[PDB]
């Protein structure tokens, strides 16, 4: 399931919009399996989806609240462990296991994210422009020189 | 229209997974006479209203900041207070979480403005350092280019 | 009832079930086979050469400069039982068009990688180095698919 | 009655006196049609177009990239095959494709964040190694393996 | 027994939260201005050097 | 749109006479599984593209 999360807040308050994704199954161990059956025997996969979704968003919102934007988009490895540490012991009591969790999107209405890349937009522009001008040096000198000789 | 330790309001959507402790024959028997013959929907409306009470209480016992950041402490406080009451109803909450936390007043949008301002420095400094070097180089480029042109044109005049 | 099936050298015929056991695949590459109507099914795959235009667009190079390139590949299923079996598992019961579509994407990967590692001059002139580099990088990868780029 | 499958498929038989289901890849099995059931899984490879847009890097700068992946089930390991089988039994190749696609993007997004634009386009070999190093261990728990990973496209609207 | 709502027609309740509305505004605004310091100085500095 | 040692382009029409070395049973057998059942025209399009390289 796509575990969407909107108008979030972070460790430095800044908001976000995130699209998380979860791979999940009933736990294939008799104790947990029996526990899970009591929730869905005689009920649909759509019912299972609707219930499970809400639980994931809770832990998701909690972890996001504990992290910075950088950690959120970059530290996917720490994020995934944290998702395993916090969401698994909770959801495990439902007799359900999140095989794996990932982030499909990181975005917001406000410019926050877009600013972090400007630095290198300018780095490469600068290198390029220098090159352009130092070629014009070379060209302009030799062109001028040839006209003299002729 | 919630309130907190400092009165400030909030609007929140909490989520709960109620189940009957069928495993305890005592608790099951106790809850059974409360809900026998009632539909899942009727049981839902009855349970829903109890949970809000504990939510309202915990919310009053917390700050906005803790409410959104400290979701773990929140959930523990919720279970600590709400569990003992619901147990007398023979009902148990498998889990509690917060799906939404908002308000029309700017309280929440404020905390992140610090970063807007920080990254704006960084952006503004990168841009200016770079444009500075660009102008430095372009200027130094202009020197020899125009100088060599005049130095050559002098020989054309000679 | 059983049928006698004749096979050309250009075809891999796989027969599942037969005179030697239950849980097995019978491997044939030209010649013939005997098949019992309900005791053994018969499925074939072509071993012929397949060639494709490996186009590449808006590239980048060792000095960043972009390019547009039209590469061409001559390819076949690897004619060695181990690799051959491995390749069959991808296309038995599937078309040459399916084979083309899958293979194409793999070649573009290595192509884009090699282009990224070279200059424009090397790219149009050093065809000899380019081809070796294509053999060094793309062959060990695509070889795991049981497919070989002849050239 | 006898039932046969090509090497591109595995047959799973469950039923009377066959409580541990029998799994055969490319073979024949004798089955009681009214007292035993047979199910199948395709062993074919799927060529997944793993898109990514609005990416970010070590220096935050974005990218738009089309990665390509060749997923296959490790039918060769009976352990892994059995593990993946209960995840995908009765599901179509298209359904399996949508499920797998979304997992790959996660690892892509992570590796992209762990790399610069320059390395992303030049160092495709290092990229692929990093992708396999991180993505393989996760997909293996799904009993799925990527034959190969490559980049088909790398662009953005910014200069 | 529990309480589902607490309200009235008169502003009484609404006043108790204003205090922290202002707390966070103040922190935010300070931040904004101290970023403008940083920006304005460095921007100005670059123009000199060029 | 060709290029040379000095980059300068050219447009050229080269001509080639391809044949299978039927005289070598080894080479013939090798080529046979590549072209068996294919028409002279199909074989022509396949060969043409190699030569240009």
From Swiss-Prot, chain F:
Subcellular location: Cell membrane; Endosome; Membrane, Caveola; Melanosome
Family, per entry: Belongs to the band 7/mec-2 family. Flotillin subfamily.
Subunit: Heterooligomeric complex of flotillin-1 and flotillin-2 and caveolin-1 and caveolin-2. Interacts with ECPAS.
Function: May act as a scaffolding protein within caveolar membranes, functionally participating in formation of caveolae or caveolae-like vesicles.
Protein name: Flotillin-1
Organism encoding this protein: Homo sapiens
Entire protein: shown range: 54 to 106 of 427
């Amino acid at each position: 399931i796509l575990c969407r999360c909107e108008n979030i807040e972070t460790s430095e308050g800044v908001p976000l919009f995130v699209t998380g994704v979860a791979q999940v199954k009933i736990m294939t161990e008799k104790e947990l399996l029996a526990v899970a059956c009591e929730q869905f025997l005689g009920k649909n996969v759509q019912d299972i989806k609707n219930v499970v979704l809400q639980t994931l968003e809770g832990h998701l919102r909690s972890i996001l609240g504990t992290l910075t934007v950088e950690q959120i988009y970059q530290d996917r490895d720490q994020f995934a462990k944290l998702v395993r540490e916090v969401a698994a012991p909770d959801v495990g009591r439902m007799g359900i296991e999140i095989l794996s969790f990932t982030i499909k999107d990181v975005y917001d209405k406000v410019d926050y994210l877009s600013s972090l890349g400007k630095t290198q937009t300018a780095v490469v522009q600068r290198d390029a422009d220098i090159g352009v001008a130092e070629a014009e040096r070379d060209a302009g000198i030799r062109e001028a020189e040839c006209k003299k000789e002729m | 229209k919630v309130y907190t330790r400092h009165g400030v309001p909030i609007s929140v959507t909490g989520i709960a997974q109620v189940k009957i402790q069928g495993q305890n024959k005592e608790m099951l028997a106790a809850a059974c006479q409360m809900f026998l013959g009632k539909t899942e929907a009727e049981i839902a409306h009855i349970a829903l209203e109890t949970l809000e009470g504990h939510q309202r209480a915990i919310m009053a016992h917390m700050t906005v900041e803790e409410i959104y950041k400290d979701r773990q402490k929140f959930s523990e406080q919720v279970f600590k207070v709400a569990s003992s009451d619901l147990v007398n109803m023979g009902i148990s909450v498998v889990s509690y979480t917060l799906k939404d936390i908002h308000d029309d007043q700017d309280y929440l949008h404020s905390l992140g403005k610090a970063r807007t301002a920080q990254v704006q420095k960084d952006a503004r400094i990168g841009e200016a350092e770079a444009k500075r070097d660009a102008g430095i180089r372009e200027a130094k480029a202009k020197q020899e280019k125009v100088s060599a042109q005049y130095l050559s044109e002098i020989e054309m005049a000679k | 009832m059983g049928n006698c099936h004749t096979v050309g050298p250009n075809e891999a015929l796989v027969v599942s079930g037969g005179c030697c056991g239950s849980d097995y695949k019978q491997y044939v590459f030209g010649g013939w086979a005997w098949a019992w109507w309900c005791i053994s099914d018969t499925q074939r795959l072509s071993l012929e050469v397949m060639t494709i235009l490996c186009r590449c667009e808006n590239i980048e190079t060792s000095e960043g400069v972009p390019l547009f390139v039209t590469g061409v590949a001559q390819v076949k299923i690897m004619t060695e039982k181990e690799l051959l079996a491995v390749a069959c598992e991808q296309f038995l019961g599937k078309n040459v068009q399916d084979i083309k579509n899958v293979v194409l994407q793999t070649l573009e990967g290595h192509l884009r990688s090699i282009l990224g590692t070279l200059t424009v001059e090397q790219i149009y002139q050093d065809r000899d180095q380019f081809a070796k580099l294509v053999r060094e990088v793309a062959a060990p990868d695509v070889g795991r698919m049981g497919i070989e780029i002849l050239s | 009655m006898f039932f046969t499958c090509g090497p591109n498929e595995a047959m799973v038989v469950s039923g009377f006196c066959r409580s541990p289901p029998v799994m055969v890849a490319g073979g024949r099995v004798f089955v009681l049609p009214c007292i035993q059931q047979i199910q199948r899984i395709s062993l074919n490879t799927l060529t997944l177009n793993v898109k990514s847009e609005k990416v970010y890097t070590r220096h935050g700068v974005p990218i738009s990239v089309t990665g390509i992946a060749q997923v296959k089930i490790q039918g060769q390991n009976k352990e892994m095959l059995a593990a993946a089988c209960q995840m995908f039994l009765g599901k179509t190749e298209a359904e399996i494709a949508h499920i797998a696609l979304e997992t790959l993007e996660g690892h892509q997004r992570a590796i992209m964040a762990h790399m610069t634009v320059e390395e992303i386009y030049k160092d495709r070999q290092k990229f692929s190694e990093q992708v396999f190093k991180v993505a393989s261990s996760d997909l293996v728990n799904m009993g799925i393996s990527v034959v190969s990973y490559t980049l088909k496209d790398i662009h953005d609207d910014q200069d």
